[PDB]
Design a protein around this nucleic acid. Structure first.
Ligand SMILES: [Mn+2]
Ligand SMILES: [Mn+2]
Ligand SMILES: [Mn+2]
Ligand SMILES: [Mn+2]
Ligand SMILES: [Mn+2]
Lengths: 481, 189, 483, 190
DNA sequence: GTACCTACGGC
DNA sequence: GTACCTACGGCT
DNA sequence: AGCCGTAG
DNA sequence: AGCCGTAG
């Protein structure tokens, strides 16, 4: 019929907004991922693109994701995937790429026709135990596939790699952190649910950007952590040295997070052309794969290069703010969270995942034990089994006779009919007894974990600690007072 | 990127505004071409609540829509030169197709309100399955959305103009807080 | 040797590129009528199990597979090639089954590969039929991680049917499409007369049959093309002159020539009138719809010989176009200009080879099966000792060796037994074996007989061609008007 | 799209002409930025044996190459104003890579023949294989083709002038028949 | 979601 | 073969 | 002011 | 002419 304009705007704009907040531009607090990422990673998984295997072309990988999970543009997906494989974008990179994946000069990647990708070993830890009923799968957009609602995420990905999303009516801006410090923060929290954010910052000293650099002071850090919002001052690593004959130069070896290096030098050369700064005679980019970032600024003779350094911090991105705005999806709705809350949520997720895996492990173990109980009955009375089968016309009559004669379940009787003649040799009989004995011991160990919450809790601690020891690394960003 | 009909009688002429050049081609192919015109949009369009009227006139898509309709703007409008009596908004039945709808209604309200008033504005009802526009053959678009016999246009009616003003300035305006309050109020997860 | 004569580098480089384009890009194969991009796409749909009973797949995924697996080139090249194969106005017998906007006659570009879907047509099944019966020679792919076919089995004359066009280096190709019914009647005549003349063949194959219909003026150009492999064929649109009211007239066009753009042709006619290069035209319209098919209307000015206007339009517009026949294709992986008889000869030899190799495969396969069943009879007959032997044994190897010595079994019969499931010991399994075995021996005899005689093999090809001709054959569209 | 080097010393400077924006990125990152410049080409370049002068001069590819070389063209060619004493051609090492090489050599012979005679023109030897330039990291391009101490560069020798003339005419000119006969004579379909 | 540059041969 | 146009928030 | 990152 | 269709 008809439609009021005002009612149509409210309905249509509200649908778009919610569809950008959830299901587009904000990360989930539990795995720290936005949908495109989660779909890329699940895809890499379900395609079996693990670190042991050779790379696959990105066009194939992006083709699968667009069609099975993510009904959007290939650009929106490759670009997202490119950022996941840049050591200067991601603090712990989730994709392992081959070919040109971009540089700090705002340098784009090569075409997806060319590059190839697989998982990293740490991505393995994101997806570990997903196929073991640890998280809930849901239907994809067309109902023709199933996708994860969240990933097992065996390390704190939200805080490790951070996030940025311009949503609608809100935004998020979360900085990367150091994995060793996060896990230790989680372990402290795990031992004292009432630990304070001040007490937690004894573990998490602050953000830790992939590009190293400096941080000025902890007043913005402590505000961000305790409230969710804070402003944090970043600076480059720059020293003053001599070049010969009393002349000095400035050497820059680390730049702020998310700053285009080429864009920054332009700004410097621009400020020089426009005479907005004094004392600069030369400016080169001496950067290479063999020496890393190196930007020199030659200083005019007998001129105070420290003064020039201090004015470059005022006038160039050499100094840059980061506006911490920690808004994540908690229970499917957006929320500005402090540090403790963000760790609390990730921990209750780990509890859930490990318990679910244990219960899944327990069910599958008892199923396989049940099957083997029947196989051993078959071995014990093989003469009678064969009689029983030879004496039957169909598969069904044989199945009914077995169930009846030997008190077997249907699954047991089926497992017997399906057995191959080869499984009757000396060694196959032994393998079956042996699998049984091991499975019994294993079942026992699983029930012990599910019998107590402290043993479960401790099991979580152990597995985190193992991850930390294997993947944890040194702080890069220096926090200067 | 405009493709007109043959009839020069606006009483019967219709124009459809399609989302994306892929859908653009599809619709140009299945239409009646005698009374139906097509003009595609190359994705998300300008938001005219946030532009200082300087770049609005640099927007090629904006300029092309004016030319197609054959009227003017604001104080220099004329309903009687409108080349069509059915200006139909046709976008993907997904949330991005909705956003674009909102960006068009904003343009109409602040520039061609008399067309809303004259009821010359409509909204096509494409099959509300998951399948976008670019993904449909031409025969489907005809029978479901283009054919005057089977289709189901929604006509746009302008009521409390004061209320509409306040709505258009909350959802599309430059004050985020009021928009953020509206989302939180009316959020149905 | 860190130097290079500029003449030698240019010679070897250009020769490398020419040869590559000629034998691996732009020229079709005389056997299956397909170019490597096209062969890899079809092989891709098959290996992806995209048969026409399967629902449609994201084209992006298909092109992704093809690009990664067999065809290391621009995705735009692969997709556009896939597009053309799904267009009823490009392919006389279309090979791809498209779901989405796949283009129009106006040069309406098809939608992007994320927006389209696709699967095989029924007739591509006949192209790929018997691919996994050792009928054709497979080869390695570019990286050495895949196997791709060097030629499809092509159970109908695809080359002449859908035609080809390709710009290569040193040479280009332009083979028009044909009517399948005439082609098959042509191959059959050939198979009954190795010494058949081109005139005799043209009693079946009148001339090209374009998917766009239209007319052809005369059999002169056609005859030259079929005899020399080269010739010019005049394609004219189907126009009629009719009354539009009040003594006014109009020309109405309903079919246009092959490979002509409808919009671009209308530009030229509009341009002609605008620049006053033709008189008597009051209006021009394109009243084409789903419902009416194609319909271009040309309003003739009152009191003008609409037939003279019509004749000028043919003369000065794409309304009439020529087709430069240039039947070049790969024969033994070498470019050659072929006449019609050559093309039909090479195809029949392909079909003979295919059907021959399929039979040997089936023979070898049936023989292998029976050899298994014999091992199985003996097994079931002594099932009590079989098990004891298996039970008494420590390893599979020990089991196998005992079985063979004790029961006179080959290694592959002893394996077949060790793999057998307990449920095969049921009551009436012995009979299935006994039933299947005898049926097998029957089949074996049939196969060996086909290979015994050449005339029987050739008769088998004729019969399998006739089926296709009856299931897939269709009426001619293009009228060859004798004038 | 040029990306030049630091040194103003032409003798030590080298310019790499690469296939594709895709590989241009990679080489831009793995080179010695002090003495090594880079200019990426979008696919197939113009074939100056067939094209007339107006079209050659409006072509951006050509333009960017003349400017970056700074020697001018034809009579105005001045070798003294060579900005690099090494112009290095770098393509995919497939059949299209070959073709692009022939086009570039045609341009140099007809418009900058002294560069060849002066030996300033080299051909890169990237690792042969199924992979092309766009599918390589920046380190594996340095270490194999741009690192002076590891790479192997083929210098382009011009000897018999008249033989080169007739060769370029035959392989690249507008007369197809001579091309066709050449292919037929030499085509070794292995 | 563009405008689209090039080679290649035959009319 | 390679394009730039827009929305959205918050920071400068 | 414009740039960050998923979207059309 | 410029356009056919695989390539960069
Ligand atoms: Mn884009
Ligand atoms: Mn017992
Ligand atoms: Mn959509
Ligand atoms: Mn392309
Ligand atoms: Mn290549």
């Amino acid at each position: 019929n008809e439609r009021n304009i005002t009612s149509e705007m409210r309905e249509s704009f509200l649908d778009y907004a919610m569809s950008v907040i959830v299901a587009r531009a904000l990360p989930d607090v539990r795995d720290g991922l936005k949908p495109v990422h989660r779909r890329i990673l699940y895809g890499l998984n379900e395609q079996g693109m693990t670190p042991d295997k050779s790379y696959k072309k990105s066009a194939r990988i992006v083709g699968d994701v667009m069609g099975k999970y993510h009904p959007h543009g290939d650009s929106s997906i490759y670009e997202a995937m490119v950022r996941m494989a840049q050591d200067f974008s991601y603090r712990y990179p989730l994709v392992d790429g081959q070919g040109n994946f971009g540089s700090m000069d705002g340098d784009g990647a090569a075409a997806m026709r060319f590059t190839e990708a697989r998982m990293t070993k740490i991505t393995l830890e994101l997806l570990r135990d997903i196929n073991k009923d640890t998280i809930d799968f849901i239907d994809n957009y067309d109902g023709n596939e199933r996708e994860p609602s969240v990933l097992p995420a065996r390390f704190p990905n939200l805080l490790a790699n951070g996030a940025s999303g311009i949503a609608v009516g809100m935004a998020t801006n979360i900085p990367p952190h150091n994995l060793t410090e996060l896990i230790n923060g989680v372990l402290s929290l795990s031992k004292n649910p009432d630990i304070s954010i001040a007490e937690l910052m004894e573990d998490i000293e602050g953000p830790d950007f992939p590009t190293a650099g400096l941080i000025l002071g902890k007043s913005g850090i402590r505000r961000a952590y305790e409230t969710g919002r804070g402003s944090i001052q970043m600076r480059s690593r720059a020293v003053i040295e001599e070049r010969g004959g009393g002349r000095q130069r400035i050497v820059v070896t680390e730049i702020p997070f998310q700053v285009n290096k080429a864009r920054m030098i332009e700004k410097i050369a621009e400020l020089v052309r426009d005479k907005k700064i004094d004392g600069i005679t030369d400016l080169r980019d001496e950067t290479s794969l063999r020496t890393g970032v190196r930007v020199v600024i030659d200083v005019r003779k007998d001129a105070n290069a420290s003064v020039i350094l201090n004015n470059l911090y005022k006038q160039t991105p050499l100094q840059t703010s980061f506006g911490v705005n920690m808004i994540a999806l908690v229970n499917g709705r957006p929320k500005l969270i402090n540090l403790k809350e963000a760790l609390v949520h990730y921990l209750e997720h780990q509890k859930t995942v490990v318990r679910r895996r244990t219960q899944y492990n327990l069910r599958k173990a008892k199923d396989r034990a049940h099957i083997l109980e029947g196989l051993r009955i078959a071995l014990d009375h093989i003469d009678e089994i064969i009689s029983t089968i030879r004496e039957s016309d169909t598969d069904k009559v044989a199945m009914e006779s077995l169930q009846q004669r030997f008190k077997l379940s249907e699954k047991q009787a089926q497992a017997i009919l399906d057995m191959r003649l080869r499984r009757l040799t000396g060694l196959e009989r032994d393998k079956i007894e042996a699998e049984y004995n091991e499975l019994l011991n294993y079942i026992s160990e699983l029930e012990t974990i599910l019998a107590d919450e402290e043993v479960l809790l401790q099991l979580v601690r152990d597995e985190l600690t193992e991850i930390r020891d294997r993947f944890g690394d040194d702080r890069r960003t220096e926090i200067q007072l | 990127k405009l493709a007109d009909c043959s009839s020069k009688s606006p009483e019967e002429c219709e124009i459809f505004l399609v989302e994306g050049d892929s859908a653009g081609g599809s619709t140009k192919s299945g239409r009646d071409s005698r009374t139906q015109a097509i003009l595609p949009l190359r994705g998300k369009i300008l938001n005219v609540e946030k532009a200082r009227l300087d770049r609005i006139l640099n927007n090629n898509e904006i300029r092309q829509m004016i030319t197609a309709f054959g009227t003017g703007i604001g104080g220099d409008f004329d309903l009687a030169k409108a080349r069509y009596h059915k200006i139909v908004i046709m976008t993907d039945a997904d949330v991005d197709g909705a956003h674009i709808r909102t960006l068009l209604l904003t343009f109409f309200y602040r520039f061609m309100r008399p067309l809303i008033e004259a009821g010359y504005v409509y909204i096509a009802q494409p099959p509300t399955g998951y399948k976008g526009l670019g993904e449909m053959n031409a025969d489907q678009l005809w029978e479901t959305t283009m054919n005057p016999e089977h289709r189901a246009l929604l006509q746009v009616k302008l009521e409390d103009a004061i209320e509409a003003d306040q709505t258009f300035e909350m959802l599309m305006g430059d004050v985020v807080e009021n928009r953020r309050q509206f989302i939180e109020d009316n959020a149905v997860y």
